[PDB]
A paper describes a structure:
[name] is a bifunctional enzyme with an N-terminal lysine-2-oxoglutarate reductase ([name]) domain and a C-terminal saccharopine dehydrogenase (SDH) domain, which are homologous to Saccharomyces cerevisiae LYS1 and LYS9, respectively. The [name] domain catalyses the reductive deamination of L-lysine and 2-oxoglutarate into saccharopine (EC 1.5.1.8), which constitutes the first committed, and possibly rate-limiting, step in lysine degradation. The [name] domain itself consists of two lobes, both Rossman folds with a central beta-sheet with alpha helices on the outside. Moreover, [name] is a unique drug target for inborn errors of metabolism such as glutaric aciduria type 1 that arise from deficiencies downstream in the lysine degradation pathway.
We initially purified a short construct (amino acids 21–451) that expressed well in E. coli with high purity and a monodisperse peak on gel filtration. Importantly, we solved the first crystal structure of the human [name] domain at 2.2 Å resolution. The overall structure of the human protein is quite similar to yeast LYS1 despite the low sequence identity, indicating strong conservation of function despite the evolved differences such as adopting bifunctional enzyme architecture and switching from NAD+ to NADP+. Some of the extended loops and predicted catalytic residues were not visible in this structure. Moreover, when we tested this short construct for activity, we discovered that, despite the fact that it was well folded and aligned nicely with the yeast structure, it had no activity in our in vitro assay. (a) Asymmetric unit of the short inactive construct shows a dimer of the [name] domain of [name]. We reanalysed the structure of the short construct and noticed that although the interface in the asymmetric unit is likely non-physiologic, the interface of a monomer with its crystallographic symmetry-mate is identical to the long interface in the tetramer, further supporting the validity of this interface. One paradox to resolve was why the C-terminus is so critical for activity, despite the fact that it is distant from the active site and the shorter construct is well folded.
Numbering used by the authors:
A (entry chain A), B (entry chain A): 24 to 110, 130 to 330, 338 to 357, 361 to 450
Write the structure that this text describes.
Amino acid sequence: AVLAVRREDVNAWERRAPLAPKHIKGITNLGYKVLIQPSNRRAIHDKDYVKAGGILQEDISEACLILGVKRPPEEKLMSRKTYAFFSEIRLIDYEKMVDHRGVRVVAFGQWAGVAGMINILHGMGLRLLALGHHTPFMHIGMAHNYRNSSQAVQAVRDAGYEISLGLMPKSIGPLTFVFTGTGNVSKGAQAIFNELPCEYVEPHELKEVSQTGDLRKVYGTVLSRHHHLVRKTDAVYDPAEYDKHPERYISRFNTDIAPYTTCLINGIYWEQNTPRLLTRQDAQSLLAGVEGCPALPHKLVAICDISAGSIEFMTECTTIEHPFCMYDADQHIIHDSVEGSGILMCSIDNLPAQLPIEATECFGDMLYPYVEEMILSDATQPLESQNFSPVVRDAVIT
Amino acid sequence: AVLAVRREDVNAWERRAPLAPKHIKGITNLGYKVLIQPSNRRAIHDKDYVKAGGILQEDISEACLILGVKRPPEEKLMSRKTYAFFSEIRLIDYEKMVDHRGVRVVAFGQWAGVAGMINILHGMGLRLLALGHHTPFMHIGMAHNYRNSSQAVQAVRDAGYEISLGLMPKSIGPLTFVFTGTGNVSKGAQAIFNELPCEYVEPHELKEVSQTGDLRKVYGTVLSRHHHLVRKTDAVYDPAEYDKHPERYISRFNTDIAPYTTCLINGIYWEQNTPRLLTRQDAQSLLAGVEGCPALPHKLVAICDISAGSIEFMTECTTIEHPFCMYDADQHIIHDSVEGSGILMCSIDNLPAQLPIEATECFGDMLYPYVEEMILSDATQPLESQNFSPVVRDAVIT
C-alpha cells in the first residue's frame, strides 16, 4: 500500500500535480507511504512535499498506485500497477469519474475561467494597441505571469482603477463583456471581471448600453438559455423541450447579442445537437472619427473560449506559448498575431496549467476522498473483487 | 509664440511624448499657449494635458514650434516652422543636444535599463521553463505589462521572496548577474536587481560564487574597466592610456567572467576602437544530473543589451512585440524563440517606450529648460540672429 506521484513529462508547461502537499500530509497521517518523484517542472517545489511527509525518490517501483496528471510515455509504464491520469495494468481516467447523476466529480473547477479571463484582458490590451489605442488593459499580463490569482487580481484592480479614473480612450466607446454557460469556469471568469469597475445589465439592454454606457465603467451580461434560444419552427422557447430536444432549437445570439458585444467569454460545454452561437456566415456579417482617435472597425474585438462547437469558425486551438490568433475577413486564421483586421481569438486547451498551484490544490481536493480506495486496490486481482465505489469503478478503462 | 505637441504616428508602440503634463503647466504659467494634438496612442491621456492648461486641437498650424518624439511623415511637415524630434524648416535633433563637455543633456535617463532588466528576468523565466525548470522568474511579466516601475518593482519583490524562500530548483545552481557600463541605463538595471535577494561580489569571486553560492540569493557584480581590459602587447592596464588609445587594448571578459555568468546586462556604449566583450568564436566556446532535475546545458543563459558592437554575434535587434531570440551552436539567430540550444538574447532599440509615462516625465525634465528659447525662435530668420544657447544651436540639423 504505497502511493507515488510521478513526474510530468508531457510538455514544458505541465506544471500541475494530481495532489498538493496538504493532501500528501493527509495520506501520510492515515498511515500510507507516499513517494514523490523529483521534478523541477512542478510549480509546487519538492521540499514542500517532503515537509508534508512525502519521500523524494526517483525509483517508484515500490508503489502499487501511481498518480499523474497527463498521459505517461508508454515505455515508462510499469506492469502490475494501478495508474490514474488523463487519457497487466489497471488504468483509471479522472474524466470518467462521475457521480450517480453523471456529473464529473474530479476536475480543475473554476481555474480555467480565471486564467482565460486574465488572458483575454491582456489580449484586448495588445489588440487595442495594434488598433492605435493605449488602454489600461496594457497593464494586465498573461495568467502565467502571475504567481497566483491573488497577485493577478491586484493587477486587474489596478487597471480597473485607471478605467474608473477616465483613462480609457473616448473614441472606442463602451466595453461590453458577455458570459455564457452555467459551469464553474464561467464563475471563475466572472470572478476576475467583478474586480473591474463593472455594471451588470440584462441582454436586452446591450443595444443601448453599447452606445451610451459610461466610459468609466465596463459592462457585463450573463447569457442564459431563455435569452437567445428559439424553436426553429416558431421561435418559441420551452425549457423542458429544449433539454429533451435541443435539435429543434436555434440561437439568435448572432443578431440580438453579438453586434453589441466587445468581448465574448464562451463557457458553454458543447453537447450533441446543441445550437451554435456563431457560424462562419455570422463572422462575415460582423466583419462587414478623428485621425488621432478613430473608432473601432467592428464592435466585436475578442472571443475567449474557456470550455475547451459553439463557434463554428473556431476550428483550431491556441496554446499558452502562442495564446492569440486573428480570424480575418477572408476566413483565414492568423496564428500568434493581434494585427490586421478581424476578431481576436483565444482557445487554450490547458488553461488551469497557467495557475498551476491553485489548479493543483483544487484538483487534489476533489480527488482526495477517492484516493484511499485506490491505494488499497490490486491491479492483478479482478475488478469485481475490488472494494470500489461506482465513481472509481466506472472510471477504469481496462 | 505658440507651442504644439504633435501626435506620434511612427509605430503602434510609440506611446511616449516629449513633454509631460507638469511641463505643459509650467509653460502655460510662463504665458505661452500650448496646443495638444489628440492621440489615443499616448500613454498619458489627453485630459491630463487639458487639465495642465493645454488646448486639445487637431490643427496645429498656429504653432511656430512643434515638438515630437520620433520622425514625422514627410508629407505632414509644415513649412516655416521649427521642429524638434529624433532623426523652409528649422530642425532640432534631441540627440545632438550636448553640454560644453559633449555629454548629452536630453535623454530618457535610466528607464531603458529599468525596462531591460524586467524583460530579461521575464525572459529567463520562459527560457528556464523551456529547459525544464519552473522558477519564480515565471512571475515577472514584460516591462510594458506593468503600469509603471513601482508596480513592476512589487512583482520583482514578490519573485525575490520566492527565491529567498528556497523555491528555486537546486540542480541549476547559483545565478550570477554581470552589469557593464557606467551610464544611467546600467544604474536603472541595477535598481531593479537590488529588489531581489541579491549579494554583490567582486569579479574575481565569480569563479567560486558560481559554484558554491547560496541558492536562496542571486549574485551580482559590476564590471569596471580595470577588471577585464588589458594591453594587446603585455596585458597591462593603464587608465589614462586606455582613454586616449583604446585600440591598444583587448578584453579578457570571455575567459575571466563569461564562463561564470548566468545573465549579462550589457550597458556599455560602444565607441570607435573599443574592444569587444565577446566574439563569435567566444560563443562557440561557451556553447561547446537526474532526469527530473537536470543541470543547465551551459552556465550562460541570457544576454540583454540595454545600450542599443560589444557583442559581435548580436548583429540583429529584437522588438517589444518579439523581445527574445536564440543564438544557437550553428551561429543561427532564431527569432521570437526561447527554445532549443544556445543563448537567449534581447536587444530592443526603444526600451523606454515600455515604461512610457516615466520615460516621458524624465525626457521632459531634461528638455524643459531649453523649451522657452525654442518657442521664441523664428525658423524664417537666420540662425545666427537667434538667441540660442550652444546646446540648442549646435543641435540644429538645417
